[PDB]
Design an enzyme around this catalytic site. Structure first.
Site, short mmCIF file in Angstrom:
data_model
loop_
_atom_site.label_atom_id
_atom_site.label_comp_id
_atom_site.label_asym_id
_atom_site.label_seq_id
_atom_site.Cartn_x
_atom_site.Cartn_y
_atom_site.Cartn_z
N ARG A 131 4.36 -3.72 9.45
CA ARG A 131 4.79 -3.00 8.30
C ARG A 131 6.47 -3.69 8.32
NH1 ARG A 131 2.07 2.98 8.88
NH2 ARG A 131 0.04 1.93 9.06
N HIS A 166 -3.79 4.10 5.08
CA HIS A 166 -3.52 4.12 3.62
C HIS A 166 -3.53 5.35 3.17
CE1 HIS A 166 -4.40 -0.41 3.88
NE2 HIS A 166 -3.44 -0.10 4.27
N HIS A 205 3.62 -5.15 3.85
CA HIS A 205 3.07 -5.74 5.07
C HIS A 205 3.53 -7.26 5.43
CE1 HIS A 205 0.57 -2.22 6.39
NE2 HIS A 205 0.83 -1.92 4.98
N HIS A 256 0.64 4.62 1.89
CA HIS A 256 0.28 5.15 3.11
C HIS A 256 0.49 6.72 3.26
CE1 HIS A 256 -0.09 1.49 5.97
NE2 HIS A 256 0.40 1.07 4.77
N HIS A 265 -11.50 0.76 2.52
CA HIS A 265 -10.52 -0.08 1.96
C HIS A 265 -10.92 -1.30 1.02
CE1 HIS A 265 -6.38 -2.23 1.91
NE2 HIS A 265 -7.37 -3.55 2.08
N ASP A 301 -4.33 1.65 -2.15
CA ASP A 301 -4.77 0.17 -2.13
C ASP A 301 -4.18 -0.55 -3.35
OD1 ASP A 301 -5.78 0.43 0.41
OD2 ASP A 301 -7.99 0.25 -0.24
N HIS A 315 0.83 -1.14 0.17
CA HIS A 315 0.01 -0.13 -0.05
C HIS A 315 0.76 1.26 0.01
CE1 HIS A 315 -1.97 -3.01 2.74
NE2 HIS A 315 -2.70 -3.00 1.65
N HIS A 355 -9.05 2.71 -1.25
CA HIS A 355 -8.31 3.84 -0.82
C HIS A 355 -7.43 3.78 -2.28
CE1 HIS A 355 -8.27 2.25 3.48
NE2 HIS A 355 -9.43 3.27 3.38
CU CU Z 1 -1.18 -0.77 4.41
ZN ZN Z 2 -6.62 0.68 2.15
#
Ligand code: CU
Ligand code: ZN
Ligand code: 4MQ
Ligand code: 4MQ
Ligand code: CU
Ligand code: ZN
Lengths: 153, 153
Positions: free
Chosen positions: A143, A63, A120, A48, A71, A83, A46, A80
């Site tokens: 993360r 995100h 992640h 962020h 999401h 995403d 993602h 998002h």
């Molecule tokens: Cu994320």
């Molecule tokens: Zn997201």
């Protein structure tokens, strides 16, 4: 074209390099590179919100979501901007990445440059996990590595 | 206000944290933080053109120079937008930074977000060294630490 780049590092073994290229303003962005040091399987991937890694990858916040949505996966309408789904590692711990995304941009209000790319711990359930956290983070866990997306030559 | 941040790291003992804040659109930018692990003396301090750290700090390219000017100090009319002069370390190896600049910005064509902040090996001569390289890099030498400037909360 417009280009950007991100070097992913963290406290453990995960590290990578991801390139972004956008031929046209408002057109799709190609995303490609390689990430190593992973456990086999899916790892949420993602953009962020913040390009802040002061305290590590946690500093990057939630995100990136300039359009006030829930999401989802990269193929979903309800997602998002940040995403990008999952990268998938083989037994060797390597994910080769080569995708195209229509929602991220390298300019304007969808611009991801100056924000943080994160890989992640766990799979992103793409909002289909059946709990509130699924429609916020995808339940992708911690993360492992991140970096700030920068303008490229 | 608009805020940005940069984590400085490299191959050596130098590391640091620099914050940016711009209260008004297109107004002065406050720059503050701390850099440690430095040798005693001056260390050139610049925003470079690219936010690319693929191969380390070298990948950032030349100083951020949207106006195609010659290198100078921050007080000079003739300067690169990225020319923030020197930080100065004591014997403790620490430079405690607190600068205001009106040429850098956190928006617009002079936006530094997504580009690389670099702290250099030696002094920047602010373009007064009497050779061609002075007017390009300030003769500040190698790149001890750097990071990509990111959007902050
Ligand atoms: Cu994320
Ligand atoms: Zn997201
Ligand atoms: C195997 N490699 C060498 C060429 C660099 N590569 C790319 N270059 C430019 N654009 C791309 C868009 C999508 C996917 C890959 C690339 C591919 C990596
Ligand atoms: C809320 N904000 C971020 C941190 C605190 N603020 C500072 N602003 C500008 N310069 C500083 C120098 C040293 C310590 C703190 C600051 C005010 C803006
Ligand atoms: Cu420099
Ligand atoms: Zn310069």
């Amino acid at each position: 074209a417009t280009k950007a780049v991100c070097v992913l590092k963290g406290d453990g073994p995960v590290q990578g390099i991801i390139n972004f290229e956008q031929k046209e303003s408002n057109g799709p962005v190609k995303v490609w590179g390689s990430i190593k040091g992973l456990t086999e399987g899916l790892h949420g991937f993602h953009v962020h919100e913040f390009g802040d890694n002061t305290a590590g990858c946690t500093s990057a916040g939630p995100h990136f979501n300039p359009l006030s949505r829930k999401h989802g996966g990269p193929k979903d309408e309800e997602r998002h901007v940040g995403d990008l789904g999952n990268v998938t590692a083989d037994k060797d711990g390597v994910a080769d990445v080569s995708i195209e995304d229509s929602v991220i941009s390298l300019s304007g209000d969808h611009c991801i440059t100056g924000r943080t790319l994160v890989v992640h711990e766990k799979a992103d359930d793409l909002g289909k996990g059946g709990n509130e956290e699924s429609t916020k983070t995808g339940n992708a866990g911690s993360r492992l590595a991140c970096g700030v997306i920068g303008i490229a030559q």
